[PDB]
Amino acid sequence: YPMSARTLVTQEQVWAATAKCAKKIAADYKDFHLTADNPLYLLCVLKGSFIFTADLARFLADEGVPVKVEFICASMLLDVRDSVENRHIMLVEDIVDSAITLQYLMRFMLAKKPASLKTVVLLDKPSGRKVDVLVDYPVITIPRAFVIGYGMDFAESYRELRDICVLKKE
Amino acid sequence: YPMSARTLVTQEQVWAATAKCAKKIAADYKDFHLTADNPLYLLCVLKGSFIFTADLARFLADEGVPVKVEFICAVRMLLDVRDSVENRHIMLVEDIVDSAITLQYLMRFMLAKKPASLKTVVLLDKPSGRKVDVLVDYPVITIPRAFVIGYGMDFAESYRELRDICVLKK
Ligand SMILES: Nc1nc2c(ncn2[C@@H]2O[C@H](COP(=O)(O)O)[C@@H](O)[C@H]2O)c(=O)[nH]1
Ligand SMILES: Nc1nc2c(ncn2[C@@H]2O[C@H](COP(=O)(O)O)[C@@H](O)[C@H]2O)c(=O)[nH]1
C-alpha cells in the first residue's frame, strides 16, 4: 500500500477481533430473546463504518444474532427509516477520537426511546477524548494516529484498502 | 438461514465471481489512468448493495483500482451526490436489477449531472423482468426472477446479514 507509513492492523487481525466481539454481543444479548421481529438493529454511521458494518453483520450471523440494518449520516442528514422505539439498537462506528460525534448521535438516538442503546467501535482512541461517553464494545484500542483503510479515508481516498494503515506524514 | 430458504450461491462463489469482475473492471479502465484524485467512484445503492459494495471495493483495491465511495438512498442526499459527479468516472453498484425501473431512474438522474463516464455493476441481474431498456455493464450473476435474501439483501428487512445468497420458495 504506497501511501501507508505502516500497517497498523491487518484484515485478518480485524476479522479475528470482530469475531470475538460478536461472540460477546451474542452472550450479552441472550436474555433479550431477540428474533426477526425484535432483532439487533445495527446503526451504520456513514461513510466510514460501512465496511466494518458489512463484516460485523456477518460475524453476528455466525453467532445466530438476528439483525436489521439502518444507515445514518450526520457529518443529521440521514436518519433511520424503521422506527426504533422499543427496539434494541447498536451504533456502529469505525473510529472514535474526541467522541463529540458519537456523543451527539447517542443523545439523538436516545430521544427515540429505544429498548436499549449500545455502541460498538472498531478503533477507539481514548487518549483523544474531549467528552465522556460509554463505548460498550471498543474492539481495538489504539494510540493517537491518523488511520486510513477498512472504510476510513484520507480526503475521501483509501477507504477500499483491506488493512488499517497509519497515513504517511504528508 | 430461515427454514423456507435454499442456497443459490455461497459466499465463496460470490467472492470468486466478484474478484473476476474486478479484474475486468481494472482492464476496462486502464486507458483512463485512474488516480486517487481521479478515481473510480462507486455509488452504493442502499440498502441492499452495502455488503456487495464493501466486498467489491476490496477486490478493486487488490487490482490497484483507486476508488471513492458515495451512498444513494432513493431529495437532499440524492441531490448532493448528483451535484458532485460532473466529469467524474462513476459506477452505480446495485444488488439486483429486475424491471430496471430503479436503475433507469438512478442512471438518468446521475447522467443529468454530466459525469465523465457512467457504468453499472449488478450482483444479480434478472433480465427476464425487464420493463425498460438499460445497459448493465457488469452483471456478475444472471438468474430467473426468484425472491432472494442474504449478502445485504432482505425479506421485510431481515436476513441481510446472511453470508450466502439464498432463494425463498413460493
Ligand atoms: N479516516 C480517519 N478518520 C478519523 C480518524 N480519527 C477520527 N476519525 C473520524 O473523524 C470524525 C471525528 O471524530 P470525533 O472527534 O468526534 O470522535 C469521525 O467521523 C471519525 O470517525 C482517523 O484516524 N482516520
Ligand atoms: N431483497 C430482494 N430485493 C429484490 C429482489 N428483487 C428485486 N428487489 C428489489 O427491487 C430492486 C430492483 O427493482 P427493479 O426496479 O429493477 O424492478 C432491487 O434493488 C431490490 O431492492 C429480491 O429478489 N430480493
Numbering used by the authors:
A (entry chain A): 20 to 94, 108 to 202
B (entry chain B): 20 to 93, 106 to 201
According to the publication:
The glycosomal HGPRT from Leishmania tarentolae in a catalytically active form purified and co-crystallized with a guanosine monophosphate (GMP) in the active site. The dimeric structure of HGPRT has been solved by molecular replacement and refined against data extending to 2.1 Å resolution. The N-terminal regions (residues 1–19), the active site flexible loops (residues 95–107 from chain A and 94–105 from chain B), and the C-terminal regions (residues 202–210) containing a glycosome target sequence, are absent from the model, since they could not be located by inspection of the experimental electron density maps. L. tarentolae HGPRT Loop III residues Asp129, Ser130, Ala131 and Thr133 interact with the GMP phosphate group. A flexible loop (loop II, residues 92–118), the function of which may be related to the formation of the transition state, comprises a region (residues 106–114) with good stereochemical and statistical values, which adopts different conformations in the two chains. In chain B, the polypeptide partially forms an α-helix (αL) similar to that in human HGPRT, while in chain A this helix is not observed and the polypeptide conformation resembles that found in T. cruzi HGPRT, Tritrichomonas foetus HGXPRT and E. coli HPRT. A loop (loop IV, residues 175–195) connects the β-strand β6 in the core domain to β8 in the hood-domain. This loop (IV) contains some of the residues that bind the base of GMP by hydrogen bonding with Val179 and Asp185 and by hydrophobic interaction with Phe178. An important contribution to the stabilization of GMP comes from Lys157 in strand β5, which makes two hydrogen bonds with the nitrogen base (atoms O6 and N7). Residues of the dimerization region are also involved in stabilizing the active site, particularly Arg191 (loop IV) and Lys66 (loop I), suggesting a structural explanation for the fact that Leishmania HGPRT has been found exclusively as a dimer in both the presence and the absence of GMP. Structural water molecules in each monomer (H2O1 and H2O18) stabilize the polar side chains of Thr37 and Tyr182 by hydrogen bonds that are found in a hydrophobic region formed by the Trp34, Val33, Phe71 and Phe78 side chains.
